[PDB]
């Protein structure tokens, strides 16, 4: 009885779809045309946004709220640290990723050529700057896939549609992270057809 | 350095609604904390070194630096369980987080339009906010706090907003005013709320 209303290429919906796949819970997923909930379903979410999760009598929106709900409701596998301090670090990194990087993604998608390129340049350089972080661990500042990777993975997956290509200093490091995460069963299972179309290896 | 002290440090804005939320939670938990009210023109060096965005509120507890009041408040609730400011179960917790999100999205945005918009906009925002707040009156006939039997982080979002109504030129009369005023009395009289106020915030009710 758990239903997720998702944007087929919506990065926020993708985050939730990865979590749902990781948790392995039974769920009905319905893709909308674009990035909005049908006007007739406004009763489910006054803001008519996706992702919107309906699990029994509880309706939730805002991917961040949905992901924590799923992690608290379905403990295994754990996607957050168990202790308060590292949990704060994780929530903060998730927030920084969304505020610093998903904002650039938004400017690239909604901007004219000039705005898009300026956002693109900044996003590309910043992503490459954190490359050293991976020479240390398999996942983002962790040895286990977590919600932080649920934020970073959908973003890096979209590099092709953002018009970004990694080469030079740091590219090898980022690509290694991308390969590790993109190869996971849950990540592959999280993909919609429109998302699979983005890369050769998943394209049908 | 703040990150080297054995006591928490909160960098706060004297009239910042978000810092107020955090100060209420610190008082409720009764933890030792050194609170520094900052000035935009001359921020303390530790804030600059630990928070690249130079914003408030910022909590420094040992080697951990947090910003974004929501993250700080949940950190405090998880690190210091007594007294509980969040529900225990997943479903109730989800609803609580959703309400905090809606209060900030629907009401904190009107507060900003009221303070930085032109007369026409400010007045339009002032009228919308007043109406919406009075519309939740029925809630207080069901429970003493906002959709809860006990004071929680949701009230830590709503209280600072209602405390600022005087500066927003809003006053409750008519239908629902009794309910809203009863809630305000209940939260504004709490030890933690009084303890959370800065002198500047107190003057908002002169």
């Amino acid at each position: 009885v758990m239903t997720l209303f998702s944007g087929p290429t919506d990065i926020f919906s993708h985050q939730v779809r990865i979590v749902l796949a990781e948790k392995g819970v039974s769920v009905e997923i319905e893709q909308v045309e674009a990035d909005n909930l049908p006007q007739d379903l406004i009763d489910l979410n006054p803001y008519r946004t996706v992702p919107t999760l309906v699990d029994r009598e509880l309706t939730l929106y805002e991917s961040r709220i949905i992901m924590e709900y799923l992690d608290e409701r379905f403990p295994h596998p754990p996607l957050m640290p168990v202790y308060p301090v590292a949990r704060g670090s994780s929530r903060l990194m998730m927030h920084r990723i969304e505020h610093d990087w998903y904002s650039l993604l938004y400017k690239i998608e909604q901007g004219n050529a000039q705005e898009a390129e300026a956002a693109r340049k900044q996003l590309r350089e910043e992503l490459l700057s954190i490359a050293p972080v991976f020479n240390e661990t398999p996942f983002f500042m962790s040895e286990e896939f977590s919600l932080v990777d649920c934020y970073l993975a959908p973003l890096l997956w979209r590099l092709p549609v953002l018009g970004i290509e990694f080469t030079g200093a740091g590219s090898k490091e980022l690509k290694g992270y991308m390969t590790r995460v993109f190869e996971r069963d849950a990540f592959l299972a999280s993909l919609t057809e429109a998302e699979r179309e983005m890369h050769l290896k998943t394209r049908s």
Side-chain angles (χ1 to χ4, degrees), chain A:
Chain A
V1 293
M2 180 170 264
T3 302
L4 172 71
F5 289 97
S6 158
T9 57
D10 172 42
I11 189 164
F12 294 104
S13 289
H14 193 181
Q15 298 175 326
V16 174
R17 287 188 265 96
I18 297 172
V19 172
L20 286 172
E22 283 288 335
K23 300 300 192 176
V25 299
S26 299
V27 56
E28 207 258 316
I29 303 175
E30 297 179 10
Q31 303 300 333
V32 297
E33 284 178 50
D35 192 38
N36 286 66
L37 207 63
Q39 172 57 47
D40 303 311
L41 284 54
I42 190 170
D43 50 296
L44 295 180
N45 174 349
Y47 308 106
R48 287 182 54 203
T49 60
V50 291
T52 291
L53 184 72
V54 181
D55 183 16
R56 278 178 160 54
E57 81 328 302
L58 176 61
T59 303
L60 289 177
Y61 36 97
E62 298 308 311
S63 61
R64 185 259 306 179
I65 295 172
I66 289 164
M67 290 188 282
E68 286 211 46
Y69 166 68
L70 291 172
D71 196 59
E72 292 175 355
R73 175 98 153 77
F74 305 106
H76 302 85
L79 301 176
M80 284 292 271
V82 162
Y83 320 95
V85 173
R87 280 169 65 77
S89 294
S90 304
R91 291 197 170 100
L92 188 54
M93 190 48 61
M94 284 187 259
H95 177 74
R96 292 182 71 187
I97 289 172
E98 188 183 311
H99 184 276
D100 292 21
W101 293 346
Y102 279 42
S103 70
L104 293 175
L105 172 148
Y106 178 84
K107 290 179 182 170
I108 291 171
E109 312 193 331
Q110 300 301 316
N112 61 33
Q114 198 178 316
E115 295 172 306
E117 180 48 40
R120 178 176 300 111
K121 173 182 182 186
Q122 189 183 328
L123 178 57
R124 184 182 193 283
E125 53 165 287
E126 289 182 23
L127 288 173
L128 287 177
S129 76
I130 67 172
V133 178
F134 301 114
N135 285 313
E136 317 177 61
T137 63
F139 303 105
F140 205 69
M141 288 190 272
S142 165
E143 286 171 28
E144 275 175 51
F145 192 80
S146 78
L147 293 186
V148 171
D149 302 292
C150 286
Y151 271 72
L152 193 54
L155 173 65
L156 301 181
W157 177 256
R158 294 167 163 67
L159 291 183
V161 297
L162 293 178
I164 294 175
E165 192 97 54
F166 288 149
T167 60
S171 60
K172 170 189 176 178
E173 300 61 273
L174 273 290
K175 291 179 180 173
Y177 170 71
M178 293 165 69
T179 296
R180 291 195 290 285
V181 298
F182 299 163
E183 296 188 306
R184 297 171 61 80
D185 295 327
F187 181 86
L188 295 168
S190 77
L191 302 168
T192 59
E193 178 57 38
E195 284 166 337
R196 297 192 202 92
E197 182 62 31
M198 294 175 184
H199 287 284
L200 181 62
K201 190 163 188 177
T202 51
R203 182 178 305 136
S204 63

